[model samples]
Target chain A: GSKNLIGRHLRLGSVEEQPFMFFATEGCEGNDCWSGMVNDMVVKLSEDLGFTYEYIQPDDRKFGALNKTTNEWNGMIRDLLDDKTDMIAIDLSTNSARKSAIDYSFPFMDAGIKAVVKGEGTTLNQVLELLDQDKYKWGVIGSKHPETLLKTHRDSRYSRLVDEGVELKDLNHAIETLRGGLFVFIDEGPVLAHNLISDCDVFSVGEEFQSFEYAFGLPKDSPYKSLIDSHLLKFREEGFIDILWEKWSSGNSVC
Target chain B: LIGRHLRLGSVEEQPFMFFATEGCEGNDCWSGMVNDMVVKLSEDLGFTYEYIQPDDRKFGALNKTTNEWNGMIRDLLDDKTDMIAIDLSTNSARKSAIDYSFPFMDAGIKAVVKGEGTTLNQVLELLDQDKYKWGVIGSKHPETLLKTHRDSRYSRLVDEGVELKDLNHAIETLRGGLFVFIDEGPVLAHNLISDCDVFSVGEEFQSFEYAFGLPKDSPYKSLIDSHLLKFREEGFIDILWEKWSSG
Candidate 1:
């Protein structure tokens, strides 16, 4: 029942006969304590599995870097296509929109979209419900993941509000708006929860509207699919995934 | 033959034609090379498709009209194409004429300025300094950076003397001078590297997502949804990305 996986040490060239290109979102820096743990897990996968890997860094200093924009990922994908990179490593989620292009592995991590507020007087869920009833407005970063999720799950009423052009703001402005009580700021789970914004409160009221699964991708029907699958299964069986989580958990700073 | 022609027109017109920008090959758009899933879709799935040629002129033309109602919608209504395959976002005004598919990609609005003597870090460092000047696109297209700059302590440094230009021409102007080009991340990043005159700035101002658009009450909506489902299940979507960013 352990997936009947076997661990084999094959030479990098023999296994795939090509260098596997690995890319991580620029903001997920391996240097950070949490990020470092994830990187260590990746390194373990490489060293133990004998797979050659490379990292593609998005220019995070740029506006679209990290979680702000999907273009960074798109740009990375373009570079991977040109360079013949074999795998993309990101904390990306599986969804209908992105399903047209990239294949996703079984969810390695599960998280929901949440709203952050300053020391919640009213839970974020309540605020969202309240806003749904009145002329209240919410701020979301343009091109950010939360904005897309909102659009995808938007209903007639929400669409009407959106159609009326409810003050769409960028990440920084959204943060400010959250602080100013102008709008509710929507973002992913970990980033907002971890960052320090005074009196910030995060909540989720919408049905776990967006659930993201972080995984590795191969070119469609890539010859390396079987190899990646086998490795992932082995990783799962060996408890490597759990180890990765423990190491990267917010509670644990040191491995 | 007449009967077959009639049937073909009905079928062709019924299925929503997805048009894409030239950039994303194998993922959202088409690539010259054929992969296994593409083969299956074309051969077994009975999906009629065609790829638009790679012409910078056409790409530029499309970008110029991306946000315009009369230009993009009018063209879609005309027989040339049905859906845009590029990273097009939906706004209130555009929603009246077009319906967007679920978001496929997310990106932010950022500024692309010449990364030379005055780096973004330098600019931020000298926020209160009186000698800096910043440039942005005209008032029509929302420039997130202008608002961001206004909010920052660097508000006084923005050169009000510089004129607002169109986004298309902003890059050229930024290249030859100490100007800034504020736009979406992908457009800026793609062009910045290719144009050789500019680089992107730190601190993304806003974010948005790219989605497929459809006409109201189009019959092919279900078909497109099913196609997306199939791709998701088979993991072909991520595979396509591997081709673009992996190597």
Candidate 2:
């Protein structure tokens, strides 16, 4: 009984149990990292809990690839509906438009918004603090959430510092513009901290101005909700998150 | 005698014809759809027609008021060019100026975003609830959606102050994350599948009818109307559907 309850490989299927599958988002590395992490975590948990598991990766190329644009999220949902995949794990933000089709797990990570400026101009800290004073101009990607946030902050005495939205590709471009003393660029924390900072001489300014969370997404009314949630709790409790960060991330800690 | 060649002129008082500046490559072109219809009408119904390629008057018109194609249509009421063919939408302003045929194709307006962990509905909902950030084509259909979202109860959640960007720029902004872009349905869908990091919303906000226009009392009106009716009856419309709707 102890062996059955502990390290024994317990078959997940009932007498007529059907085979189950798992699908994860290609958020980064074409879903390979996310899927591999999940599979490893699942195997470890199952070995401890005495369960034998078998699953398949649907050949649906759509779910297997990362969507470079924000628009393709719907197609990924359609892929899930078409049985091409079974789950999603990525920076999939919560929204009302998708509540009908998928179930979302509690946010595993909070991705905050931050502004990046050139390392040359009075330093990043000086520039961000100077925004409270007039005469400094700030530029952001036109019509993005950060532009709105900056504009909302514009009514202050430092309102003159906020510039109109500018067209820039990423924080690097924003930092490049800042280097020319044109304007400061705003972007998400992960992009600014994890990717842009190491690649460019730009630095994140101020605390994160806005906050959003990233969660594991699932199909609507999935039977696997409890199972996934349980694993997520265990992953957090067993320092698996740190392990994952160390193993997957390029040795950069956002925490 | 049936008119063989038609030359139309433009004047200040009679600016009513829908004129397009760019040719086929531009968003608004009347040559392909309407011209094809005219070719079919001429061959089958014993009529002869020719399209006079006029340098787009939008740029060269001497007077800003009279140089427009609509102005030329108003100036020349004679039966020279039987019809103007282009991608003209039937709107209130144009409806008052001239008579138009039934819509040949219905075009819907939509928004596009990259396909990631979330669906379009989810993204829109998130934008509505202000849970996620979005980018929209400033002063376009997507901007209208943003404004509507801001005015609703979800305003508390969203950054109601969110500004709008141009369509192309919006597409670029949404490249890596949860950004959104809006455009005409066909254009949006085409871009979503053709380019990387783009997908469109499933539902459309409004539908546009691409139709043809005729002078109020033109002699070809009855004939064109009859042909259209007959085509609708003889399953010709079905043939077009099979050709276009098929993969």
Candidate 3:
């Protein structure tokens, strides 16, 4: 029935990630509240779909990570699989391993991981020079999306910043470490965040491999997946999606 | 070898020309704001295409040290690529080396302030503005525009804690007597460059036109322009623009 979502107030999950999902320090979320490009999009969907939703976050605070021990998961992905939440509407990456557990809506923003550095001096020459692992220290989230791009060099000196991208502190510590010269942040930062580096007093190295398609994560075989994907195209065409992205991410990029 | 299979040079930029690594088992093998446009353009032209990655990581910035245009421009000049459907800025220097289709979009420096922050005095303050404590990121083309700026009292605001949402937060606040920030035209304009959240002061500061750059003597020039002009007329370009501008 087209009435599948007629009256249900779905529980949605998100974590505090800037530009994508997070508690807006100033947007003054009074009630079923918070803000991010994704939060805004989900709200738009509820209006179009004629459904109600309440937002929630993980108790421990993580985007999500896999636990092989019980073949289970933790964070937002875990909640979606347990059906504790209907879908994830934050900066969750649509990757292979997670596909087995959940479905994803049509992706909107291309979330390419980028490298952050301290100087505009990083070019092909610098990237070529850093081929030696010990010569340079590259900081990555360590768990999420590192290997396929950085693995070929087989550099063990490539440092992982967080075990599972759980706490926002991990990203904070990584940036602080780079600033302190503990490491140069030779490798990566999310594409949107890195552009703000100049104002941040650091330099961004630039885009790395192809972007990871960012989309909403839905429970497996969920009827809502196709429905949401269709709306994504509509929202995009209407400028609703792009407006939120510009307001949050890529605030500095020269369109 | 030529039209049957065209080699189109591109450098990846999100919202335009995303080369998917997997899941797309068949079709175009790439998607994004620009890729989607190019795919449809290629389909319309009945051309089979393969995207060529430039060894130089650039779309087409002129490297003064080499006195050369690198990236896709170099590829087109060197006969490595037949056509480009990417968002390229127009410049007299590059214009000398290449031909361009009718611009599908125009972009330039645009200003933004907090939502509730826009008031008569705030709007009036932005008018005939003084030395604004400018918020800027480092890049060649932008640096060129900054020095030429004729606005208010300007000082550089560079910090390390400001990136992504924090950077956006800085723009959102626009606190102090004033804090200022700017963004690229095509990038910001893709969101139509005229949304209400953050308002535009003006791009009279600097500007550029985005078009499909082609080799100077390429036979495909008129054909591509005819299609582009038609797209623009039919509002097809507007539809695509609306989809990706915010994209």
Candidate 4:
């Protein structure tokens, strides 16, 4: 049954979440234009599972969030539930809500949520004690694990990111906001490490508040979930995932 | 999938599978990890299964000359058996022939020597110098792994080394204190716990994980795999390992 995907064309939903995914400015003829860590991994999966795929994006550019008004889900997760995509691959973190809504492959990578700032020598707890919430602003990628953590901090005042409309658009926007003075960007630790090298001024500050096991998301009770899980487990045991981590996040570390 | 009687394929292996001759009732003749897993699975799925095996009693391998699979693989392909439960490792070649559940155990390759410790590469060098005799069980992953390795030492061993017929021969060779028997790490571990005379040495090589094999396109694959994953996640697999290791 694992080979049932052979000769099938799979629609894979993804967005430009860098080093995991990169979308070319000019769309090209083949899947070659879609390149990055997760894209390379998907290519390998296709080869091993005997399938073809075309990378796609959600029309709204959102990963997925509940539309409470209509009681409907939107974005990539919605696309998966609606049969518009076979799988959604990116820096997807497995959480309680997503676990109930869909299936997940065993995590290909692990990371933790942390805060990044323009300067170091400050933990988040210390910063909270030192600065007035009104004087500084907080930002995160909307609908991401970091946003969830920022919203539910022990100091619930951090929830203003949603009330004040400061939940940023994407990874690049979050870093851009961090570069601006009087702002803190919360995101995954590994992503912060990868971005810190680009700007000497930015540094990851604070211990991780939440840990994540990143995995590929699928439709609920998907037939292929276990097959992919088996492959990913093998990849982890054989050190392929570590090799990919080193290759993509080279010259940077979260230690 | 429920309330149905099915045929379950199995092979004889220690702590994983135990076989008995005549005078056995339903599920009475079987014991070990294989039996325990099947009993647990049947309870969850509501399907009762009878144990079946191939005439050859092998896990099965591809016969390149005939371009066909032999042993339990043949039985599954021919629909003589519905599934195989044992220490079946998932390999690319085998995956091409049948579907496998997510691996329940990590069974990397290891070497056994007479009360000793050394790396696989180092032991191979000693064997090449005729300091010791080396061999692997025939008709298993160990033999294929060595014969296909790019390392010249592995190639030399396959050419000049003995092909041990089974665990009995391997044990006899180990008893001589001049033989290195290469096999799955769990197999080596099981033997080492019971027999203190032999030592399991060498860093585990050739990442192999044991799983259940079913016929390609089997409808039961997903349901079975989901539960197996649950078992792994909920620590049932660890309990089985501890239970078997202590025995």
Candidate 5:
């Protein structure tokens, strides 16, 4: 039988990740209103699949991390796992640990850890070589894949960097810190690239590393995975995903 | 979680699956890239499977009057087989009818000409010439593209090009030295290696993916996809393809 979300009211979960998910003033209704790339994506998805959705955020208002010691998940992932939300549409990185707890739709974006430095066209190796200098500091958004990647990296320099480097509150603080001093801000390539559109002071140097897919989260074996993936494949073929990415990120480019 | 016996729908396609060896039955009947893949999948997932082929041995085609797909697709849809474990192209029409695992191979339409090189435009222009005939095996992506493309040459080829029923017939036609065959990259490349007289010409077009087919909402999709992803990440697919291509 064909599966659909027709006439189904769904609880859409997300963290306050800018560009992908966040509060927007335009094209949204009452409280908890949202309109970003992810929200716009759901809008298109609803248009194609015939469903309505209400936005819901985590109680702690933070993107949760898995407590490896306790083997528990917190944040939007836990919300979906606990049936508090039907879907989590954010820049959620798809990894094996999270995959065991929830299924993911076909990724809309492919990105990896990237370095943003004050200098132009700096390679990751060059950045690592300069890590010995006391004035050269590195940082990433806390509890994100970039931070996790550094901590578990095969290279000892990266693992050691996470221990010695700063963990910023969010992309905003990371940007401010990089602009204020000699800082190497590492985060998801797409996220940092988005920031590069506005602030020309920093440059995303070198090829992206530790690449991963960005997908919507769902309950384990969710029937919607197939339907969503089918549409995503079409969206990919039709170049609609590229258009959306350009509309949000490229259109804002100043550099 | 699904540790159970399964039936796999497949067809005789070279470098992907072959059943020529004698005294083999059921699961041991087939051999090739797909066989290796499925064997590994079965070993990891604890599922046993028997290779089954449809009576017609056709991949499938939609019957306009019946409003249903026939051949191996129908077999899976009717639960005659658990999955289609062959070189199934993940096209838009197919996706609407059945689900597919993540694509294991990326493919594109390529033109196979005898000996020396020829571009797609050159091949299409040959349709107008007296010495040459152009065609592909079955009315798949190549035929569809010819019919739908805005280019006048494609439509001309549609009107004049031969629609081959079998791969052997298509290759034989190419061997005649006056025919050009347009087919998927892997198939054409296989023949290119097997037959020294044949050569691929022009850039590949109409890029598509080949995946194992399953019934809509198959319970084992996620499990299968997880391992498939691992195979991709570990460069197993590349190594496997290289082994087959070099052979």
Candidate 6:
């Protein structure tokens, strides 16, 4: 009665994200597929929580968010929310909307949202560089992250310069729209991405998108929420997750 | 539950613990959150406890230069009291000296105002909040939450906010939404002596959890912990949240 978690073999799922979750050199010909952060977390959780699990993936390599268009989800979020799988351990952003849709475990990583700027911090006036003097407009995704991030930063200088930040739909939109010597704000991942590929053209300002934590997704009100999260919290405190992150990230390679 | 009788120390804070003026006639000489919970706990446990007030009577404040606790927290550490359950706000200072039960209530700071009126929401509807005068008990944890937010409204809130002496004066300023009563809603709730229509506003900000402070290496720690968790799980605590809040 105390959670029924000891022996229930679960159907674990993954949608590949990088540095957090990617494929292994080895394959699961319906037996096992290796993933980076989340699948490892699942294995650690299974061992810690007295359970067993089998790995699976989505129809597409996608971790979903709510699409208000037809009142449905896009990929693995729907896959788990629709109870197609028991757990999803991607590098999922834990926002208010996603939290309302489903539950998330204790956030394992502390990732700051970013303002990938043209100038690092030359201006004595921090807020001015984003918009004033250079005529560069700041941007973030209006989808979900910015809705929360913008409000928290509204009383901040980011809103004062632009008078309510420019709401682009997603990071790709920022790429297209801000090609004219402008600044785009997104997660640290995307900021790193453009900086890596763009041959030193892009730089990031320390002005935060928001320093939010990331977590694994679970079905809403699942008994596993407490057990999973408590164990995750332990893993963080004990530094086991740190070791796992190094192991996983070292396993990742790109062409 | 301890094997022997226990001496539990407490500070005189509203809602958490209060030495009653009139209730001595009934021999239920004290009444408050901790007192009432202890009464319920006695029904389940066998040990008896006496209400303890140490020589220093104060709920411990950190002495920064001295690097010491100067009140009942010192009493607990020096073996003066077995446990203390005032509105013992959980702070890092007392934590190394003591172990705390998991914090027991909503940590968010919210607005408390007279429930019958639109003076508060009407201002929000017009989107001009700093226009209102907010009142709080001065220099307490609620005021601390008010200061924690980085928003300009919060800055202006502390700028214009009225820190009053007590709840009597606070609700007096609050009678008709003449004041935006900003404080820990339920923490300040038990001070509303009259059975009236005053409530905290829906908007909440900041999070600071409170817990019962216990002696370090307490023998009864694990037992009381299960009790506290059971209390939470069984809705025994939410009833207290509602009682001190809505009452």
TM-score of candidate 2 on Cα atoms, chains taken together: 0.31
- Model 1, residue A40: distance off in Å is 2.4
Cα lDDT tens digits, model 1, A1-255, are: 122213432121001100112224366653231234335555666675556554544332111112335443433344344343555554444554444445544334445566644433444454346444433456555444455555555355443433343444444455566666535556666545444223424334444434444455444444554445445544543446667655544452221
Give the CA lDDT, 0 to 100, for residue B169 in model 1.
Answer: 63
The native-contact fraction of candidate 3 is 0.00
- Complex DockQ, candidate 5: 0.20
TM-score: which is higher, 2 or 5? 5
TM-score of chain B of each: 0.55, 0.52, 0.66, 0.89, 0.88, 0.66
Which digits, one per residue and each the tens of the lDDT, describe model 5 over residues A179-240?
Answer: 88667888887777666666777765566665457878888757687788788767755557
lDDT of 2 by residue, B1-247 (tens): 1434323222111011233555644223333334445556767666554444333321011223453332223333334445544433333333334554433444555655666545547334654444346654332323333333424532322344334443345556667555555555644543345465465555665334444556655665545544653453334544554443313
Q: Rate the local accuracy (lDDT) of all candidates.
A: 0.44, 0.44, 0.56, 0.72, 0.73, 0.59
Answer with 3 or 4, whichever has the higher DockQ.
Answer: 4
- Model 2, residue A75: displacement in angstroms? 50
Provide the lDDT at A121 for model 2: 44
Q: Taking the tens digit of each residue's C-alpha lDDT, what string does model 5 give over B92-201?
A: 56677888876677677788777655443556667557766788655354565455455777767756778787677888888888678887888777756767767666
Q: DockQ for each of the predicted structures, in order?
A: 0.02, 0.01, 0.02, 0.07, 0.20, 0.02
Put down candidate 4 lDDT per residue, A1-255, tens digits, no spaces. 335677889999888877788788786766877888888789888999898999778987877765446877777878888898989988776554454467666566656677766744433453343245455576677766666554545566656555564768877787777788566776787777776676766655567654445778888657777577667766755567667777887484433
- Give the TM-score of each candidate: 0.38, 0.31, 0.45, 0.66, 0.74, 0.43
Best by the DockQ measure? 5
- Native-to-model Cα distance after best TM-score fit, residue B237 in candidate 3, in Å: 25
Docking class of 6: incorrect
lDDT of 4 by residue, B1-247 (tens): 6987778888777778877777897678888886888899999999989888888766776776788887777888889988888888766566667877645776667877785454445546655466678888766667666665657687677668887776667778877887787788887777667676676655777665688988866778767766775565445777887787645
Relative to the true structure, candidate 1 reaches a TM of: 0.38
lDDT of 2 by residue, A32-114 (tens): 42244444555565665555544333333222222235534423445555554455544443332343346555334445567
